[PDB]
C-alpha cells in the first residue's frame, strides 16, 4: 500500500524564500509565511489566492493557526510574534520579550496560550487574550528550532541546536524529560504525534526518529532524505495510510511508511530545498514549500 500524491497546484506570489506552510484546522485554508515578511492565505482545495497579511518589519520563520481557524500567530526576525485576525487581516497583538529572532510558534489546543522558541535560547508561553508573556523557560543552550503542544496542551516539546529535545509541564514550566544523543547532532525539528504518545524528531544528520518519550526509547528511524543545514518541518499523515512526510535539501518531498520505515513516495518538482511540508486535517493533501530559488508552494493530492 503506497500513496500516489500527484501535483495539483503551484502557488506563486512570495518574493523571497517561503519558510512555513500550515493548513487551518477546519481544512479551508493554507497559510504561508515567508522571508518576504508576508503571510499569504490560499484556498486548500482550489489553491486560489485569498489575501496577503502584512506588518512584520523583518522576515517570518513560522506561522500557526488557532484551533477555531480564526487567528494566526507568526514568528519573526524582528524579535516579535504577531497575532492576526484572519478575517480582517489586522494585527491584534504584538508579543514582545524575546531578545533575538523568533523561530517557531504554536497555539495550544484550547488556543488560550501561544508557545514560542527563539534564537535567544528561551521558550516563552504567552496569554493569547492579553498578549502578556506568562513564562520564560530557560529551555536550551542554543537556538530553539521547534515548539509544540501535545493533544491536551498539558505538555510542550522543544528542540534545539544544542542537541536536546525536552518535554515541559505547561502549567509549571518544569522540565519533565530530556532526550539525549551521545553524538549530540542538532535537533532541527520536533512535534508530538496526533495522539500525543510519541515525538517525531529531526536531526541535522539526515535522520528522523520516532521516540516514545516517556520510556526514552527510539522506536523508528527514517532516512534517505538530505537534511544537514535547515530546520525542515516533518509531519504525521493520518487521513489515509499512516505516513511520515518531510521536506529535503535535495528539493524532494519524502514520504515513508510510519511502521515499516520504507520510503513509499518522493515528490519531484520543487527547485530548491523543501523547507516546509504540511498535511491536511481531513483530506489526503500535502502542501510543500521551498527556499529562494523556488519561492513557490505546491499542493499535492493522493487517493490514500
Amino acid at each position: 500500500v503506497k500513496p500516489n500524491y500527484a501535483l495539483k497546484f503551484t502557488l506563486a506570489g512570495h518574493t523571497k524564500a517561503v519558510s512555513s506552510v500550515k493548513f487551518s484546522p477546519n481544512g479551508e485554508w493554507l497559510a504561508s509565511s515567508s522571508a518576504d515578511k508576508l503571510i499569504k492565505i490560499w484556498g486548500a482545495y482550489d489553491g486560489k489566492f485569498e489575501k496577503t497579511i502584512s506588518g512584520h518589519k523583518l522576515g517570518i520563520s513560522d506561522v500557526a493557526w488557532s484551533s477555531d481557524s480564526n487567528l494566526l500567530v507568526s514568528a519573526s526576525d524582528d524579535k516579535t510574534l504577531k497575532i492576526w485576525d484572519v478575517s480582517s487581516g489586522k494585527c491584534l497583538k504584538t508579543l514582545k520579550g524575546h531578545s533575538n529572532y523568533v523561530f517557531c510558534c504554536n497555539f495550544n489546543p484550547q488556543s488560550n496560550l501561544i508557545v514560542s522558541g527563539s534564537f535567544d535560547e528561551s521558550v516563552r508561553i504567552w496569554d493569547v487574550k492579553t498578549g502578556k508573556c506568562l513564562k520564560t523557560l530557560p529551555a536550551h543552550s542554543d537556538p530553539v528550532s521547534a515548539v509544540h503542544f501535545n493533544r491536551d496542551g498539558s505538555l510542550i516539546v522543544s528542540s534545539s541546536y544544542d542537541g536536546l529535545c525536552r518535554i515541559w509541564d505547561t502549567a509549571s514550566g518544569q522540565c519533565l524529560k530530556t532526550l539525549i544523543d551521545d553524538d549530540n547532532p542538532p535537533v532541527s525539528f520536533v512535534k508530538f504525534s496526533p495522539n500525543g504518545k510519541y515525538i517525531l524528531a529531526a536531526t541535522l544528520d539526515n535522520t528522523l526518529k520516532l521516540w516514545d518519550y516517556s520510556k526514552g526509547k527510539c522506536l523508528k528511524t527514517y532516512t534517505g532524505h538530505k537534511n544537514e543545514k535547515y530546520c525542515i518541518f516533518a509531519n504525521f499523515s493520518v487521513t489515509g495510510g499512516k505516513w511520515i512526510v518531510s521536506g529535503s535539501e535535495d528539493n524532494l518531498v519524502y514520504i515513508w511508511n510510519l511502521q515499516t520505515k520504507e520510503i513509499v513516495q518522493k515528490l519531484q518538482g520543487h527547485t530548491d530545498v523543501v523547507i516546509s511540508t504540511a498535511c491536511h486535517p481531513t483530506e489526503n493533501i500535502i502542501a510543500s514549500a521551498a527556499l529562494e530559488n523556488d519561492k513557490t508552494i505546491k499542493l499535492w493530492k493522493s487517493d490514500c
Binding site: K16, G59, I60, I275
Partner: peptide, 7 residues
C-alpha cells in the same frame, strides 16, 4: 531573509 531560510 528569515532565520529559518538561512543556513
Amino acid at each position: 531573509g528569515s532565520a529559518r531560510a538561512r543556513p
